[model samples]
Structure formats: structure tokens, C-alpha cells
Target: SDLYPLPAPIIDVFPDEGLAKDMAKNLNKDSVNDVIDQDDLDALTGLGFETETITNDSMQLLERAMFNNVNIVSVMEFGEDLTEFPDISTIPHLNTLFFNTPPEGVTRNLSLPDYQNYPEMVTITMSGSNLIGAIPDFTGMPDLSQLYMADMMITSDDVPDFHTIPKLSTLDLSHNQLTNLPDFQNLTNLAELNLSFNNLTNTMTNFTNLSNLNNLNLDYNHLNELPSNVLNSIFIENQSGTVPDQIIKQGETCTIQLPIYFQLAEINMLVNPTVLGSYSADIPVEVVTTTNADTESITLDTSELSPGVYNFNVQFNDAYPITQEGCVYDWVLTVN
Candidate 1:
């Protein structure tokens, strides 16, 4: 009769081998908040509980916890000896799973528990675990909102389709081997994104469509420049006017202020003084050669030709090219 009334309460166990072994002997079957230490793992298995070992001495306690119907299980500070994890498809009501960093030399392919088994799971964090391989698809977890996997070896090529999880608002994939990014426009609810210390180059042009994005980090990457449209969306202000409309005297060098740093590929100048009287369609005009000096500005040599209206078309490097139309600016050169 005493065993029939299960003592259900929140249990937090840590790494003292003696204390853990004692706790295991008196663990309640109805315990709801079950957080354990790795040292206690072997103790639980020895206490009349059948367990599966992932390594020579370490046990996969999630299986044993599931057998006893413990809903929440969190393992902190796992070591290199415990490398493998068993299938978590049978857990009835697991709502939260958290794993802190494992030992340095321990590399393992960690898979998440099936969403079908725990549809109520809302948060899953496994940071600094030296995990390898692609993350399992989380499409089945419709309610998952926060996923953090930083300081791992994950890459953009290994991540699953993020758009499948509509409720995901906070995601951290920094310090990885990602070279490109997926279209994040579909994640309208995403407010924060961190892709720092990765291998990304020019793949960030699609972030303009994320209207709800409030905080973004792309620090320490190979990005030489960003597209003009993306730059305008992020840095530029007052979108209603022609950019840098200036008048210069003939034979003088003309300088235009650039909003952000850009790596120029080529510069084309149309010097026809065309669109005359709104009647001319194709007027013959001399093409002027322009020079690109630095990232902040461009200089045009106007010493060769007569003064007229000119259109300057600047092209940035193909690695981060600016494809936004209407980015060209016009200037009027008067003969002195």
C-alpha cells in the first residue's frame, strides 16, 4: 500500500556519487521535474532498473526514466565517456530536454527525441556538445519555439528546413562551419539571429524580407560587402530622394559619398546629355571612363569632355553584387 501511493515531487540530483546512489534508492515514480547527474546514471541502473549502456561504463538514463514514466529529464555536464544516446520515441510527456557541454574530445551524432512521442516539448538546448552530423528534421514539433545549438560543428548544409517550424522565434547557430544561409523570409516571427564566426560570404541578401527581425549578428565572417538593397534596408535613411545629386565644373574630379563600404567591380558613365526635351530616345553620348578609389567613395575624371548631364552606373564585386534597380545616381557638370 505504501508503494502504491507514488511520491511525486521535483527532484534535482547532482554528481556526488554517494548522494546520487542514495537518491536512486528512494526515487519516486511520480517525480515530475527529473534532473540528474551522469554519475547517478550507473546507480539508477543498478537499482533494479534495466538500463542500456551507450559506452563501456556510462548508461543511457533516458530509457530507464521513460520506463518509469518520468516526464522531464535533464542531464548536465556529461563527460566524454558517455557518447551515444538511445531512441527517445517512447517517452509519453517529455516537455523539456537540456544538455550542457560534453567533454572536449567526445564527438557524437546526437539525435533528438521523436516529436510524436512528446508533442508538448517546447524548448531544446544542446550547446557546446561537439556534436556532428545534421540535425534531425523538427517538422513534427509544431510547438517548438526556442532551439539553441551554439559552439558545435554544425553547418548551414547540415541544418534542417527552418521554415518547417513556424513557431521558432529564437535560434542560435553561431561558431559553426556554415558557408551559406537559407531563405529566412518565411520566418516572419523570428526576432533574433546569430551567425557569427562562420564561413558565410555573400549569402545574406535574403534577410531583407524578415520584417520582424529586430536583432541580427554576422560578425567575424568573410563578407567583403553587402548588396545595395540590403545596405539601403539596413543603414540608409530618407528613401524619398535622389542620392548625392551634385554639380561639378569641367576638368575637375567629382567625388560621391557612399553610404557603406563597397568593393567595386566596374563603373560605367553615360555622357550623352541624353533625354533631351523628353523627345530623344537614343541619343549619341560619349562614355566616360571612371575610377574606383576606395570602399567609401568613387572618383570620376571629367577633364576630357564637355560639361553635360551624366549618369554613373557603379557595379560592385560579384561576391556581394548589388542588383537593386534605381541605385544609379545622376550629376550635372557645368563648363567653367
Candidate 2:
């Protein structure tokens, strides 16, 4: 026996009462009066983690993962009391993290943790939140693949420089208020990207950089123009004017029934015999704003002009907040 011996077992106290009870339950004890060993905490790592309350249990995960070599890979916490997101620090093996709450449950307003803190994070499915704020730059986090953050109120300023994270395979930032986006031309590994339902003025101008992208969704945004190469895929050279022109009786009022769906319509004569130059006739039209339902019309008083086959280009425009419009090719007005 020696004169001095090792110190007695030191008991680690949990700062949170809920965490202490959970820890005790995990260790098969009445309370944390017994010394919680590192090996005991190791039992909670590298597997699916479930908790009654994410607020305390996730904090406990961070605490237990801090002092020991523990890595909680996946945490699916639909805990009723978790009103906010937890500080997801360095968990080297962490891949997937999922959380959900009721409509009256989470305010979903939490500042993002530094991206450098969680480098190995793969899939983070967080949506339908009241989130819109400046995000931290994602420069160091490289292993991130799929990011599903949509249905929020994020703007251009809220987004970080996404060019740094080059390994992104799928990114969904749809149904937001994003007027502009960071340069995503460097995401070479990107295959699927959903940027729909936003208030963007421009879209993917450079599709050559994202060569692997197949499943793309840029529908219903304020897109100025689609890339030339993008149109090349769906473009045909032949003029298939198989559809007959909408006929009207001569010396009578002709209400031009535009078959094309347009929120607003303007009648412009591309070719007219009466006027050698282009013609712009005052058309009385009632443009009902609806989608894929009814056709917009314009009433033209043909009693003033000579009845003949005149070539007209119906300039169909989108409604409010839509400057980028599409004009139909040809609408031959046969008023005879």
C-alpha cells in the first residue's frame, strides 16, 4: 500500500434537471449520484438518437460528446418542447439531422451555427419556418450534399457565398422571397436544383458550369430569359401553323378570342396593307387575371378598316410583378 492513493470517483452533475433524469434512465440508475463514466456516454453515439425533449437531450448530447469521443450521427427529435434549434457543434460523423413540430410549436427563428463547427453534416431538412437572416459563409464545410431549406422568407442578403461549397448534389431553396442568389456556377457536382416560386429577376445564366444538372425547376419565377442552350433542347425549326386563324365577319365588330393564355394582351399588326409601317390599333379588352382557365379577348371595330387577311402578333404579357412576357408567333386576322 502506498502513502497516497488515487482520488475518489468524482460525480459529474448535469446543469439541467431534465438531462440528469434522462442520463439516469440511460444508465439504469435512480439518479446521477453515481459517477457517469466516459464509457457510459459512449453508449449513446454512432447511432440513431431519440429523445423526449430535444432542448435538453440535444444539449446533453453536446455536453456528453464534448468531454468524450462520442459522435451522434442521426437525431430525429419531434419533441414537443423543442421550440428552437440546438447548437450543432463538431460531430465528426454526423450525417443526417431532422426535426419537426406543430404549427403552434416552433417559432423557427434561430441564428445559424457557424458552418465550420459542423463540417460532416450531410442532409439537413428544415423548412416551413419563419426564417430570414444573413447566413454564415460556408467555406470550410465541404462534405455537405443535400440541403432542403424552403418555404421561408429568405432574401438575397440572407444567402451566403454558395460557390465555396462545391460538392452540393441537391439544393432546394424554393418558395422563398429570394430576389437574387449567390454565384452557384462552381457547384459542379450539383445534379438537382429547385429555385421555383421565388421573386428572382434572373436565373441560371450559366448552365455549362452545372453540366450534371438534370432535374431542374425554375418554374413560376420572374425569369427574364432562359439560356439559349436550354431552349435548344426544346426548339424546332419548322413553322407548324396548322392551327387555323380566328375568323371574323367583315363590316362588323370582331372580338378577337385569343386562344393563348395571357394575363394581358396587346394587338399589334406585324403586317398591314393600309399602313406600310407597323400598326397599333386601340383594342378594347377585358384581361381577367387567372392561370390556365379562360382566354383573354380584345374587341376590334372592323367597320373603320378594309376587310383583308392581316398578319398580327398578339403581345401577351404577364400580370403584375411580371415584366418578362412572351409574344405569340402569328395570329392571321381574316376579317372578310
Candidate 3:
């Protein structure tokens, strides 16, 4: 019974070898984690293992095995209490992770005790278990392409700034109690996004920044209508990098146009969805232009324009637009 570190019957099976002779030849007097090295991992088609009620120490051992080589193909750490495995950045080569179970006292306030790293991680699937509270900022992982976190108790306020992830292609935040999605204007590489089965009332405005997005899922939520400009801006950005700067003038005041269906109730223009749709019927005189330049009283008067969302077709007309629908927006802007 104690022959294997783990219970033999409970251990997950590995990939089947074509020949028993090959398996016999490769078998050695190495630790179970040792066999999960780079060369052995490369030879493996995929990982085949399961953990039932695993502790943080066991998870660290697996992480150490992965750290030995930077070529791990797949890894799963579901149903294990990983509250002690705080430093997730150590396994940079990890392409997949399942942190469904957190320690007894873990807060989801986007604060990972030592979780500021992870470069090559591709997929992070952690949903339902005990990921309560706010989510952490994923700006450090440049290569993280897919993220799946649904049905957890994490709220919208806990979701950190995910737009900073450069290569994020897919995201799933559904079934949880999230009220809003994040502004994905900077996530140019995102191709698929899912925000379903939550308390989302207005989280659709920031889609204009997702130029590469192809498939979007917003099922079983509190959404009523979709913004035409949001979709239009996405199309425009995908087809063309930016709109003409003249349309979005700077210093000198200019009037812009809104979509034809401006006052329609089904349009849902007033709701602020993470990044877009912040305008309403009451507010007039939008400051479309601002400059960090050595100028003063430069205001973008959307006064003449009707109630609709429009971007200046010009660049740095008054000041660089912080985050135009079709153009890339950031946290700050400069006048000069």
C-alpha cells in the first residue's frame, strides 16, 4: 500500500505507449515527478493524472517537477486546496492550470500573495470552488491566451485589469455573480469572449477595442440591447486601424454624429459595460478633445451632434484621445 507515494488505484493513468517494450526500456528508478521532465514531457502526447483531495505540498512537488524543464505540455490541479501554493509564477512553462480549490481563508480581492508572474501560461481554468472576492490583475502574463473562470463567487469589482494581457485570446467569466465585464480595449489579441449567466446588465460597450474578436457569448444575463456603435467600431478597427482624425477633432470645437437609432430604449446606451456605453440622453457637450500641449480651453463640443456615440476621425486634433472606440485607449493622455 505504501509502495507508491500516491494510492495506486487512485492514481491517474498516463498516456499509453505503443509498445510495452518501449515502456519497459524507459521506466527507471526516478521519482514520479522526475519522469515529468522536459524530454519525457516532449515524448508524452498529453498529461494523464488526477488528484483527489491533494494538499499544497503535493501541488508544490508537481510544480517543482514542471520547473525542472520549461517545456511542460499540460497540467491540471483541480479539486486540490492550493491556498499554500501562492507563488504561481514559478512554473512559467505551465500551459494549463486548474485552481478550483483555494485554501480555507483566501480572499478574491485580486490579490495573489506572491502571484505577480507567469509568462508562458496559456490557459487558466479556475471556476467554482472557493475563489471568492475580487480577481487579481493579469497584466504580468504576456502569453496567457485563454482564461476560464465561471460559476465562482467572485464579483465584478474583484476582476482586475485584464486588458493589459497582450496575447489573451479567449476569456470566460460566466455563472458567477459578476455585474460587469472589464474594458478590453487594449486586448487587441483577444478573439473570443464569454460573459454569460451572471448579473450583467450593461457590459457590452467595450467590444469596440476587441478588434480581433470573432465569437462572443453573452447568454443568460441581464443584458437587454446591444450598442450598434460598439459593433461598428469593432468592424471599422478590424478593417482599418483607426478612424480619420478629422472626425475626432482636437482644440477647436467640433460637432459629431450619432447612430440613427439614438433614442431607442432597446439600444442600451446609458449602461456602462466595463469600457464603453457611458453616455446618456441627459448629458450634453461632451469633451471629445483634450490636449497635454501648451494650450488652454480646448474643448470637444458634441453639442451640435445628436445622441449617439462617435469618435474623432483625426489624431491628436486637440489632444490624443484617451480611448477612442476604434482607436487604442490607455489610462492616461498627454497634452503636448
Candidate 4:
């Protein structure tokens, strides 16, 4: 009958009035993973547990846990009504802290402890909070690698100096109100950058230096145009499907139509006529006249061009600073 003992079925214990009272009696247990109350906190002191996940609303319990020197490596505060950040910087070996969805109506301007005190911290996530003002500076945090701050009300001024953390690889700042970005050329090791759904208006100029970057999300922004150097560095090839062919004979008038509809502001063109073997001189095209937005076409008269090959480069600018598509096009025309 005792040949084999059946494996004990794992039971998930939840915090209730009965279990909470029962746990208070067992003072020797090292780790607690349930919603601890005031009595439960008093019993868990000096146990020297390595990890503790608190899901309670009492800040007193958090203070007691720190006061007893629990030597916790991770602290996860979930759905806690914490008005201010608790000073857990004294915990020597703590490396990870997650503040998930603090209670509603809590103060949004949450301050963080100086990261210089916690060199072992590697990851910090504060998602779905109403945090405002500047993000806590990580000036001396060299070991931090991942940071996620999605769905917060962070602005451009709230952004901290990201260049200080050279080891950072993944940064998520989506669903915020950031209008401009900080100079990110120093983040050479960055692989994934998420700046989606923000109010970014300026051209992304700092991305050329991120040589190791492979995943970039710049959707739903007011970006006008990207620099050629930035485009080349990111390995994005020119889209040929949208560019039109421009070949005309000498003394012929042609009307060039833009591929995409844009609020036309100004149109400029440069024509380099072929001299000897290379196209070396710039010639101006006589802009006959212009049409309004409904037509969206430019009329050019190439009557004065000699019998030679010419390189035509056209550029379009939008009424507003933001452009919807490519602003430059190149073509070759043989006038015979």
C-alpha cells in the first residue's frame, strides 16, 4: 500500500479573511505572494525572503517590509493606491520594480529615487499610469537595459537624457504627447525604438547614428520629409512605383503631374543639360503658368533646350510644414 505516494496536487492559494488570519500564525514562512494585510505584514518581518509581491493598499505594510530588511530582489506593486513613491532605495539587492496601474485619482507627478543608489537595477516598467512632468533622470544608471513607459501623459519636456545609459537597448514611449524627440545619435546599440502615436513634427534627424537599429516605429506623426542621409542609413530604398517617367523631345511642352495629392505650396526644379559626356550645367525651365489644387499639375516649356540629354529634378513643398509623401523626384529627358 505504501509502494508509491501520489504527487501532491498543486493548489493556488488566494488571500481571503480565512487565509489571511491563518498566514498570520505561520510566522516562519520566508516568502509571501498574496494580498497581505496589516497583521500579515507584522508577521512577515525579518524572514529574509528573496522576493515579495505585494497587492495590498496599505503603504504601512510596504514600509514594514522595507524596515525589516527583507533583502528582496524584486518588488511588484499592482493596483496599489500609492500617492507617492515609497523609498525602497535602501533595499541593497533589489534589481526590478514594476508599478502597474496605480489607483485612480492618485497624484500623477510621481518622483523616483536617484538611480545612482541602485546600480543593480536592470528593468523598470511603469505602464498605464497618469504620470506627468519629466521622466526620472537615469544619469548614473549604467546597468539599465529596458524601460517601458507606455500610455502615460509624458511630453517632450518630460523626456530625460537617454544618452547617459549606454547599455539601453529597448525603449517604449508610445501613446504619449511628445512633440519632439531628443538627440538619439548617441544610442548606438539601440535596436528597437517605439515612438508611435505622438505629435512628432520635425524630421527624424538623429536616427542616422543608430547603426544597429533594425526595428523603428514612426507611425502617425506629422513628419514632413526625411533627409537622404537618414534614409540611406536606415536602409530604405527609394520607391520607384510612385515616380513618373519624364522624357520629352526638343521644343515640346510637357505637363508634369505629381503622383500623390498634396497641398501645393511651392514647386522648384533644376535642369542639368549634358555637356560633352557629363551633365554639368544647370538650366532653368520656363514655368508657363500654374493651376490650382483641383488640377495639381505643373506646366513646363522646354523650347529653348539644345539637342542633348538633360537631367530633370523636381521638388515639391506642402502648404503646411508636414508632407504626406516624398518631396523629391528625378528623371532624365533626351531632347533630340
Misplaced by over 4 Å in model 2 are: 1-13, 20-36, 46-61, 64-90, 101-106, 201-208, 220-224, 229-336
Worst 10 residues of 4 by lDDT: 2-11
lDDT of 4 by residue, 105-204 (tens): 6533344555565566677777667664567667756878788887788888888666677777888887887877776756778777777667665355
Q: What does the lDDT come to for candidate 4?
A: 0.49
In candidate 2, list every pair of residues with a backbone clash.
none
Those runs of model 3 whose alpha carbons end farther than 4 Å from true positions after fitting are 1-49, 63-80, 84-92, 99-117, 202-208, 232-336
Q: Give per-model TM-scores.
A: 0.52, 0.54, 0.48, 0.49
Give the deviation of candidate 4 from the true structure as CA RMSD.
14.9
**Which scores greater on TM-score, model 1 or model 4?**
1
Q: Pick the candidate with the highest TM-score.
A: 2
Score each candidate by Cα lDDT. Answer: 0.49, 0.50, 0.43, 0.49
What tens-digit string does per-residue lDDT give for candidate 3 at 61-147? 333223433333222333334343345433555555554434556432222332454555677766555464456666566677888
lDDT of 1 at 3: 19
Off by over 4 Å in 4: 1-81, 102-109, 227-336
Clash numbers, per candidate: 1, 0, 28, 0
Best by lDDT: 2
Error of 2 at 286 (Å): 12
